Amino acid sequence: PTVHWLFTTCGASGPHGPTQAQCNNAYQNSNLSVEVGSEGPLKGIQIWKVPATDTYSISGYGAAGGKGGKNTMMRSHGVSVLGIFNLEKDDMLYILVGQQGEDACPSTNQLIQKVCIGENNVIEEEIRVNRSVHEWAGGGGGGGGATYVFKMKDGVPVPLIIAAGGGGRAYGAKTDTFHPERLENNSSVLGLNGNSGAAGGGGGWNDNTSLLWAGKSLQEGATGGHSCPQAMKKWGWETRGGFGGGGGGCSSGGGGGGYIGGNAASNNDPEMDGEDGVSFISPLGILYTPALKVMEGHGEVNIKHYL
Amino acid sequence: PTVHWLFTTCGASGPHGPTQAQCNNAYQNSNLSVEVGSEGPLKGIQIWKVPATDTYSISGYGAAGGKGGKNTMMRSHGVSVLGIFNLEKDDMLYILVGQQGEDACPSTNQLIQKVCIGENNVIEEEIRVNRSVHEWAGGGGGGGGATYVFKMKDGVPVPLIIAAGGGGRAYGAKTDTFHPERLENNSSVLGLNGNSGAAGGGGGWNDNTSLLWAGKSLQEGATGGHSCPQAMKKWGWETRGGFGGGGGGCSSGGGGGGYIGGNAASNNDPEMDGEDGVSFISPLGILYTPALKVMEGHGEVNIKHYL
Amino acid sequence: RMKDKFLKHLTGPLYFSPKCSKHFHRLYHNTRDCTIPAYYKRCARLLTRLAVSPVCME
Ligand SMILES: *[C@@H]1O[C@H](CO)[C@@H](O)[C@H](O)[C@H]1NC(C)=O
Ligand SMILES: *[C@@H]1O[C@H](CO)[C@@H](O)[C@H](O)[C@H]1NC(C)=O
Known part of the structure; x- marks a missing residue:
């Protein structure tokens, strides 16, 4: 049959979700029509009505983290979780498509861009002299x-597929962290935020979520965290987290969103x-393929009727 | 083996190539050192010295086109050409790494961004009234x-691998046409520019190349073509082609660069x-795998030894 | 035919443990990323991340 409903970010990018007008244009001439939350914790979340009772394969893709600084190393990719689920007719599936975290370089500021290309070495200078980053964050x-x-459900959301996002790459990240994936399947484990610092x-x-620069949880709007407080008032480092619980950027990398935040x-x-x-x-579904870091940029959701 | 030489855009993006200083930082702590043309038609082209006579596997990757307008549909990916070549010691390989074509949204102009988010519908208005786009391009x-x-060669450059770039996505392109690839291998066919309109x-x-908004040929510097003339004087739509012969953007999508321009x-x-x-x-080389549209974003070049 | 020849170049001489024999088959042949040629850049990263997972180790 090859009936596939593909969900994207509707062209939105940054710490905020898409609008209804953006998604109305993004799904033009398609077989898909969704509702978008206009205000509140559901702002930017797409609502899709399941058309028929059948066995569906929901392919979730997380979003990647932000690029590093002068090094511009490979960004940490998002995670892919592919599962098989049973859905009933007229079930209302809520889908939040994760957006990429904002990159450090390149930038539109003239003073910032000289730091990205390696001509302005004030950041490297302070590290060499005083052993850490305290002023030029x-x-x-x-x-x-x-x-x-x-x-x-009646009053409480119940998760089905959560494709975790990748963490932000640090400024001087000569290493790539070489990190394995993590996948939880017990709803009794509560998905708290990450260790914001x-x-x-x-x-x-x-x-x-208390800290402004920390990523908001799903039930709080999942707004991307603001930039580092110390990275302001000295620069214009507006490196914020992606829509979907992304953490704000600093001299170090920001944490990625997911069930349990990075x-x-x-x-x-x-x-x-x-x-x-x-x-x-x-637990209501079957894991088709284990979680794997595959996605660069924005995430997606794909439904394909597997068995 | 550590014969893994990877070539990137050195962090450069847009209609112009990278500088010598940018590539010196991009290849830091690597086994790669190249020369970059400082001015003229060789500006932004990386020059690599072949270290030894052997059988090399040259993996070429084109760059993808720019994103659409309000729809922000899937961009046309770049083309991958993987070949096997015999090279001699001290041969001077010239490498131009294709850069991604500029997206339409987001933009830095105050008036433009209101069109990207769907609040300013002058573009949709003129289409409904006068059936086509003539003023608000x-x-x-x-x-x-x-x-x-x-x-x-003695005085004339001779191509070995050309990985074509992807075309720009149009503003209201609700479909992706799924167009097939094209690959030429007869040097008697001259690679002229595309039909610019x-x-x-x-x-x-x-x-x-005469028109400003058309992509320059390889022997002319391969500079990305400027934005649409009619998209100026009314907007600030600086949607230009990517470095490597990319065509300029307009209401319609711009053509991608290559041997024969799109x-x-x-x-x-x-x-x-x-x-x-x-x-x-x-013709002197062997195609390992036929051309496939795979690359999203900037292109790459990969040289290894497997044989 | 050719998918097998192309993707090996991207991932190199990757090894898979017997515990991931059916995990590899499902990912390589049945997942959307490894069936659309436009997403072969995705499939290469999928297989590489598979080899470093705790299941496919040793
Ligand atoms: C390092 O030295 C002191 C801190 O001990 C500080 O005042 C100075 O500004 C620092 N240098 C730079 C380049 O930031
Ligand atoms: C449509 O009519 C004419 C085209 O001949 C043009 O001058 C006018 O501004 C157009 N109207 C809008 C709303 O674009």
Whole structure:
């Protein structure tokens, strides 16, 4: 039959989700029509009505983290979770398509761009003299947003597929963290946010996000965390987390979103990246392929009727 | 083996190539050191010295086109050409790494961004009233640059691997046409530019580019073509082609670069994409795998030893 | 035919443990990323991340 409903970010990018007008244009001449939350914690979340009762294969793709600073190393990719689920007719599936975390370089500011190309070495100078980054903060990418697929019960959302996002690459990240994936399948494990420090941590499933630069949880709007407070008032390092619980960027990398948010560097280490998020698959489904880092840029959701 | 030489855009993006300083930082702590043309038609072209006579595997990757307007549909990916060649010691390989064509949205102009988010509907208004786009031009992405790998003979450059770039996505392109690839291997066929129209066409191997918004040919510097003239004087739609012969963007999509440049819409059709470029492989080499559209973003070059 | 020849170049001489024999087959042949040629850049990264997973180690 090859009936495939493909969900994207509707052209939106950054710490905020898409609008209804953006998604109305993005799905033109397609077989797909969704509702977008206009305000509140559902802002930017797409709502799709399941057309028929059948066995569906939901392919979730997370979003990648932000690029590094002068090094411009390979960004931490998002996670892919592919599952098989049974759905009923007229079930209302809520889909949040994770957006990429904002990159550090390149940038539109003239003073910033000289730092990206390696001509302005004030950041490297302060590290060599005083052993750490305390004054000229910034240069790392923001945390990537996670892709959430859930359906509302009577009053409480229940997750089905969560494709964790990748952590932000640090400014002076000579290493790539070489990190394995994580996948949880017990709903009794609560998905709190990541360990936010100088850089913002990742947003989880259900938490109480306090820090502005930390990624908001799914039930709090999943807004991308703001830039580092110390990276402001000295630069214009607007390196924010991606829509979907992405953490804000600093000299260190921001944490990526997911079920359990990724951790962040506690002391603004310029060589320490933010950690990737934790993926989740509901016990109601069957894991087709284990979680794997595959996605560069924005995430997606694909339904294909497997068995 | 550590014979893994990887070539990138050195962090450069847009219609111009990288500088010598940019590539010196991009290849830091690597086994690679190249020369970059400082001025003239060789500006932005990387020059690599072959270290030993052996059988090499040259993996060429083109660059993808620009994103659409309000739809922000899937960009046309770049082309991959993988070949096997015999090289001699001290041969001077010239490498031009194709850069991605500029996207339409987001933009830095205050008035433009209101069109990207769907609040300003002047473009949709003129289409409904006067059936076509004649005044408020712009909104399509620029053509992607191609990756050129060639070595100079006595006085004339001779191409070895040309990985064509992807065409720019049009503003209102609700469809992706799924167009097939093209690959030429007969040097008697001359690689002229594409049929430039309202939007700029792709730059070829050897042509005489006149229009500003058309992509320059390889022997002319392969500079990305400028934005649409009509998209100026009314907007700030600086949607230019990628470095490597990418065509400029308009209401329609720009043509991608390559051996033979991609064609462009002749009447500024807002729903008609620009066409992808034509790839080329030298008859002296062996094609490992046929050309496939795989590359998203900037292109690459990979040289290894497996044989 | 050719998917097998192309993707090996991207991933190199990758090894898979017996515990991932059916995991490899499902990913290589049945996943959307490894069936659309436009997403072969995705499939190459999928297989590489598979080899470093705790299941496919040793
Ligand atoms: C390093 O030295 C002191 C801190 O001990 C500080 O005042 C100075 O500005 C620092 N240098 C740079 C280049 O930031
Ligand atoms: C449509 O009519 C004419 C085209 O001949 C043009 O001057 C006018 O501005 C157009 N109207 C809009 C709303 O674009």
